[PDB]
Ligand binder design. Sequence first.
Ligand SMILES: C[C@]12C=CC(=O)C=C1CC[C@@H]1[C@@H]2[C@@H](O)C[C@@]2(C)[C@H]1C[C@H]1O[C@@H](C3CCCCC3)O[C@]12C(=O)CO
Lengths: 13, 249
Amino acid sequence: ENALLRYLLDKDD
Amino acid sequence: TPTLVSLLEVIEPEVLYAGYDSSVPDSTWRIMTTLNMLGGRQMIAAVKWAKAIPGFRNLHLDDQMTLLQYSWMSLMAFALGWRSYRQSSANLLCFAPDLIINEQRMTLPDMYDQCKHMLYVSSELHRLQVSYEEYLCMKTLLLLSSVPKDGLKSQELFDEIRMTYIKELGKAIVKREGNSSQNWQRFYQLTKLLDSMHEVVENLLNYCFQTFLDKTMSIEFPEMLAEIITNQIPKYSNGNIKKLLFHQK
Ligand SMILES: C[C@]12C=CC(=O)C=C1CC[C@@H]1[C@@H]2[C@@H](O)C[C@@]2(C)[C@H]1C[C@H]1O[C@@H](C3CCCCC3)O[C@]12C(=O)CO
Protein backbone atom coordinates (compact mmCIF):
# COMPACT_ATOMS: atom_id res chain seq x y z
CA GLU A 1 0.00 0.00 0.00
CA ASN A 2 2.71 2.55 1.21
CA ALA A 3 0.20 5.30 2.21
CA LEU A 4 2.65 7.48 4.23
CA LEU A 5 5.50 7.64 1.61
CA ARG A 6 2.90 8.36 -1.16
CA TYR A 7 1.52 11.26 0.95
CA LEU A 8 4.97 12.74 1.70
CA LEU A 9 5.76 12.64 -2.03
CA ASP A 10 2.29 14.07 -3.05
CA LYS A 11 1.98 16.89 -0.46
CA ASP A 12 3.57 20.36 -0.91
CA ASP A 13 7.14 20.34 0.63
CA THR B 1 22.27 30.34 -13.03
CA PRO B 2 23.47 28.26 -10.00
CA THR B 3 25.65 25.16 -10.53
CA LEU B 4 24.04 21.74 -10.09
CA VAL B 5 26.37 20.87 -7.14
CA SER B 6 25.35 24.12 -5.35
CA LEU B 7 21.68 23.03 -5.75
CA LEU B 8 22.48 19.64 -4.11
CA GLU B 9 24.29 21.49 -1.29
CA VAL B 10 21.45 23.92 -0.46
CA ILE B 11 18.94 21.04 -0.04
CA GLU B 12 21.23 19.07 2.36
CA PRO B 13 19.04 18.34 5.46
CA GLU B 14 19.99 19.91 8.83
CA VAL B 15 21.53 17.43 11.37
CA LEU B 16 18.82 16.00 13.68
CA TYR B 17 19.17 15.35 17.43
CA ALA B 18 18.31 11.91 18.91
CA GLY B 19 16.81 13.37 22.12
CA TYR B 20 19.02 10.94 24.09
CA ASP B 21 19.33 11.72 27.83
CA SER B 22 23.00 11.23 28.86
CA SER B 23 22.06 11.34 32.64
CA VAL B 24 20.24 7.94 32.27
CA PRO B 25 22.63 4.90 31.88
CA ASP B 26 23.07 3.22 28.49
CA SER B 27 21.61 -0.04 27.27
CA THR B 28 21.82 -1.52 23.79
CA TRP B 29 17.98 -1.80 23.69
CA ARG B 30 17.56 1.90 24.60
CA ILE B 31 20.11 2.95 21.91
CA MET B 32 18.55 0.69 19.21
CA THR B 33 15.03 2.03 19.98
CA THR B 34 16.20 5.70 20.01
CA LEU B 35 18.06 5.18 16.70
CA ASN B 36 14.96 3.68 15.00
CA MET B 37 12.99 6.79 16.14
CA LEU B 38 15.78 9.06 14.78
CA GLY B 39 15.89 7.02 11.52
CA GLY B 40 12.16 7.62 10.96
CA ARG B 41 12.64 11.41 11.24
CA GLN B 42 15.73 11.25 8.98
CA MET B 43 13.66 9.34 6.37
CA ILE B 44 10.87 11.99 6.46
CA ALA B 45 13.64 14.61 5.81
CA ALA B 46 15.12 12.33 3.04
CA VAL B 47 11.73 12.41 1.17
CA LYS B 48 11.70 16.26 1.28
CA TRP B 49 15.38 16.16 0.14
CA ALA B 50 14.85 13.73 -2.81
CA LYS B 51 11.86 15.82 -4.09
CA ALA B 52 14.23 18.81 -4.40
CA ILE B 53 16.99 16.92 -6.31
CA PRO B 54 16.85 18.33 -9.90
CA GLY B 55 15.18 15.72 -12.11
CA PHE B 56 13.80 13.43 -9.35
CA ARG B 57 10.23 14.84 -9.46
CA ASN B 58 10.16 14.30 -13.28
CA LEU B 59 10.25 10.50 -12.74
CA HIS B 60 6.94 8.60 -12.49
CA LEU B 61 5.58 8.86 -8.91
CA ASP B 62 5.89 5.02 -8.64
CA ASP B 63 9.63 5.26 -9.51
CA GLN B 64 10.11 8.00 -6.87
CA MET B 65 8.61 5.62 -4.26
CA THR B 66 10.67 2.63 -5.57
CA LEU B 67 14.01 4.51 -5.42
CA LEU B 68 13.42 5.82 -1.85
CA GLN B 69 12.31 2.36 -0.67
CA TYR B 70 15.32 0.58 -2.21
CA SER B 71 17.94 3.14 -1.15
CA TRP B 72 16.77 4.30 2.33
CA MET B 73 19.44 2.29 4.32
CA SER B 74 22.24 3.27 1.89
CA LEU B 75 21.35 7.00 2.31
CA MET B 76 21.23 6.77 6.16
CA ALA B 77 24.45 4.75 6.46
CA PHE B 78 26.25 7.05 3.98
CA ALA B 79 25.14 10.31 5.72
CA LEU B 80 26.08 8.60 9.03
CA GLY B 81 29.55 7.86 7.56
CA TRP B 82 29.91 11.56 6.59
CA ARG B 83 28.86 12.89 10.06
CA SER B 84 31.25 10.40 11.73
CA TYR B 85 34.04 11.49 9.33
CA ARG B 86 33.54 15.23 9.98
CA GLN B 87 32.94 14.99 13.75
CA SER B 88 35.42 12.45 15.15
CA SER B 89 38.25 11.67 12.60
CA ALA B 90 39.32 9.23 15.45
CA ASN B 91 36.72 7.67 14.64
CA LEU B 92 33.34 6.91 16.34
CA LEU B 93 29.78 6.57 14.97
CA CYS B 94 28.17 9.98 15.31
CA PHE B 95 24.41 9.15 14.80
CA ALA B 96 23.45 12.58 16.20
CA PRO B 97 25.38 15.32 18.16
CA ASP B 98 23.68 13.93 21.34
CA LEU B 99 24.21 10.23 20.43
CA ILE B 100 27.76 9.15 19.60
CA ILE B 101 29.01 5.56 20.09
CA ASN B 102 31.95 6.66 22.30
CA GLU B 103 34.59 4.31 23.87
CA GLN B 104 32.34 3.61 26.93
CA ARG B 105 29.46 2.68 24.52
CA MET B 106 31.85 0.42 22.54
CA THR B 107 32.20 -1.75 25.71
CA LEU B 108 28.50 -2.78 25.43
CA PRO B 109 28.29 -6.54 24.51
CA ASP B 110 29.49 -7.26 20.89
CA MET B 111 29.26 -3.49 20.08
CA TYR B 112 32.28 -3.49 17.68
CA ASP B 113 30.70 -6.27 15.52
CA GLN B 114 27.42 -4.25 15.48
CA CYS B 115 29.28 -1.06 14.40
CA LYS B 116 32.12 -2.22 12.06
CA HIS B 117 30.17 -2.06 8.72
CA MET B 118 29.08 1.53 9.47
CA LEU B 119 32.57 2.46 10.82
CA TYR B 120 33.99 1.16 7.49
CA VAL B 121 31.98 3.83 5.62
CA SER B 122 33.49 6.70 7.69
CA SER B 123 36.94 5.08 7.64
CA GLU B 124 36.85 5.01 3.78
CA LEU B 125 35.55 8.60 3.50
CA HIS B 126 38.51 9.63 5.77
CA ARG B 127 41.08 7.45 3.90
CA LEU B 128 40.00 8.78 0.50
CA GLN B 129 39.74 12.38 1.90
CA VAL B 130 36.31 12.70 0.27
CA SER B 131 35.23 16.34 -0.23
CA TYR B 132 31.85 17.91 0.49
CA GLU B 133 31.09 18.31 -3.27
CA GLU B 134 32.15 14.66 -4.00
CA TYR B 135 29.98 13.52 -1.04
CA LEU B 136 26.89 15.44 -2.28
CA CYS B 137 27.20 13.78 -5.70
CA MET B 138 27.89 10.35 -4.16
CA LYS B 139 24.83 10.49 -1.85
CA THR B 140 22.55 11.48 -4.78
CA LEU B 141 23.99 8.51 -6.73
CA LEU B 142 23.06 6.20 -3.79
CA LEU B 143 19.40 7.21 -4.20
CA LEU B 144 19.83 5.95 -7.83
CA SER B 145 21.80 2.74 -6.97
CA SER B 146 19.02 0.06 -7.23
CA VAL B 147 16.11 -0.45 -9.61
CA PRO B 148 13.49 -3.32 -9.99
CA LYS B 149 14.73 -6.30 -12.10
CA ASP B 150 12.28 -5.22 -14.90
CA GLY B 151 13.34 -1.56 -14.57
CA LEU B 152 11.48 1.65 -13.80
CA LYS B 153 8.46 3.24 -15.61
CA SER B 154 10.71 6.25 -16.52
CA GLN B 155 13.85 4.10 -17.28
CA GLU B 156 15.22 6.40 -20.06
CA LEU B 157 14.82 9.57 -17.96
CA PHE B 158 16.27 7.73 -14.89
CA ASP B 159 19.36 6.74 -16.96
CA GLU B 160 19.75 10.39 -18.09
CA ILE B 161 19.38 11.67 -14.46
CA ARG B 162 21.87 9.00 -13.26
CA MET B 163 24.45 9.90 -15.98
CA THR B 164 24.03 13.63 -15.08
CA TYR B 165 25.05 12.93 -11.44
CA ILE B 166 27.92 10.57 -12.50
CA LYS B 167 29.22 13.54 -14.59
CA GLU B 168 28.67 15.83 -11.51
CA LEU B 169 30.82 13.41 -9.45
CA GLY B 170 33.43 13.76 -12.23
CA LYS B 171 33.33 17.59 -11.89
CA ALA B 172 33.88 17.36 -8.09
CA ILE B 173 36.88 15.01 -8.57
CA VAL B 174 38.51 17.38 -11.18
CA LYS B 175 38.48 20.18 -8.50
CA ARG B 176 41.07 18.13 -6.50
CA GLU B 177 43.27 19.31 -9.50
CA GLY B 178 45.24 16.10 -10.11
CA ASN B 179 46.32 14.97 -13.60
CA SER B 180 44.08 12.93 -16.00
CA SER B 181 45.58 9.68 -14.56
CA GLN B 182 44.94 10.78 -10.92
CA ASN B 183 41.33 11.77 -11.92
CA TRP B 184 40.71 8.28 -13.41
CA GLN B 185 42.14 6.62 -10.23
CA ARG B 186 39.99 8.86 -7.97
CA PHE B 187 36.87 8.12 -10.07
CA TYR B 188 37.63 4.37 -9.76
CA GLN B 189 38.18 4.69 -5.95
CA LEU B 190 34.98 6.71 -5.27
CA THR B 191 32.78 4.51 -7.50
CA LYS B 192 34.26 1.36 -5.80
CA LEU B 193 33.15 2.87 -2.44
CA LEU B 194 29.66 3.43 -3.99
CA ASP B 195 29.53 -0.25 -5.10
CA SER B 196 30.68 -1.38 -1.58
CA MET B 197 27.55 0.38 -0.09
CA HIS B 198 25.38 -2.49 -1.49
CA GLU B 199 27.43 -4.88 0.72
CA VAL B 200 27.33 -2.58 3.81
CA VAL B 201 23.52 -2.34 3.38
CA GLU B 202 23.03 -6.10 3.11
CA ASN B 203 24.67 -6.39 6.59
CA LEU B 204 22.60 -3.50 8.02
CA LEU B 205 19.33 -4.84 6.55
CA ASN B 206 20.05 -8.33 7.95
CA TYR B 207 20.16 -6.69 11.44
CA CYS B 208 17.24 -4.30 10.74
CA PHE B 209 14.97 -7.08 9.33
CA GLN B 210 15.77 -9.49 12.22
CA THR B 211 14.89 -6.82 14.86
CA PHE B 212 11.78 -5.71 12.95
CA LEU B 213 10.44 -9.28 12.49
CA ASP B 214 11.32 -10.71 15.91
CA LYS B 215 8.49 -9.23 18.03
CA THR B 216 9.91 -10.98 21.16
CA MET B 217 12.83 -8.45 21.08
CA SER B 218 10.35 -5.58 21.83
CA ILE B 219 12.29 -3.36 19.34
CA GLU B 220 10.00 -0.56 18.10
CA PHE B 221 10.23 1.10 14.68
CA PRO B 222 8.34 4.34 13.83
CA GLU B 223 5.61 4.20 11.11
CA MET B 224 7.96 5.73 8.44
CA LEU B 225 10.44 2.86 8.82
CA ALA B 226 7.87 0.08 9.49
CA GLU B 227 6.14 1.01 6.18
CA ILE B 228 9.40 0.90 4.15
CA ILE B 229 10.57 -2.34 5.89
CA THR B 230 7.17 -4.05 5.32
CA ASN B 231 7.42 -3.03 1.61
CA GLN B 232 11.06 -4.15 1.11
CA ILE B 233 11.13 -7.60 2.84
CA PRO B 234 9.09 -9.41 -0.01
CA LYS B 235 11.28 -7.73 -2.70
CA TYR B 236 14.47 -9.22 -1.17
CA SER B 237 12.62 -12.59 -0.90
CA ASN B 238 11.50 -12.72 -4.59
CA GLY B 239 14.81 -11.31 -5.99
CA ASN B 240 13.09 -8.21 -7.44
CA ILE B 241 16.14 -5.93 -7.06
CA LYS B 242 18.86 -5.03 -9.53
CA LYS B 243 21.87 -3.60 -7.68
CA LEU B 244 23.57 -1.17 -10.10
CA LEU B 245 27.36 -1.39 -10.17
CA PHE B 246 30.08 0.87 -11.56
CA HIS B 247 32.52 -2.10 -11.56
CA GLN B 248 31.46 -5.61 -12.70
CA LYS B 249 32.42 -8.46 -10.34
C1 LIG C 1 18.61 4.37 10.11
C2 LIG C 1 19.70 4.47 11.22
C3 LIG C 1 19.23 5.62 12.09
C4 LIG C 1 19.86 6.79 12.18
C5 LIG C 1 21.11 7.00 11.41
O1 LIG C 1 21.68 8.07 11.49
C6 LIG C 1 21.65 5.91 10.59
C7 LIG C 1 21.01 4.74 10.52
C8 LIG C 1 21.65 3.63 9.69
C9 LIG C 1 21.75 2.32 10.51
C10 LIG C 1 20.40 1.97 11.20
C11 LIG C 1 19.95 3.19 12.09
C12 LIG C 1 18.75 2.83 13.03
O2 LIG C 1 17.47 2.82 12.39
C13 LIG C 1 18.94 1.52 13.82
C14 LIG C 1 19.31 0.33 12.91
C15 LIG C 1 18.12 -0.05 11.97
C16 LIG C 1 20.60 0.73 12.13
C17 LIG C 1 21.10 -0.63 11.58
C18 LIG C 1 20.87 -1.59 12.78
O3 LIG C 1 22.09 -1.59 13.56
C19 LIG C 1 21.68 -1.41 14.93
C20 LIG C 1 22.80 -0.90 15.85
C21 LIG C 1 23.49 0.38 15.36
C22 LIG C 1 24.70 0.66 16.28
C23 LIG C 1 24.19 0.92 17.71
C24 LIG C 1 23.44 -0.32 18.24
C25 LIG C 1 22.28 -0.70 17.29
O4 LIG C 1 20.58 -0.49 14.86
C26 LIG C 1 19.80 -0.91 13.70
C27 LIG C 1 18.67 -1.82 14.15
O5 LIG C 1 18.32 -2.73 13.44
C28 LIG C 1 17.98 -1.59 15.48
O6 LIG C 1 16.74 -2.32 15.58
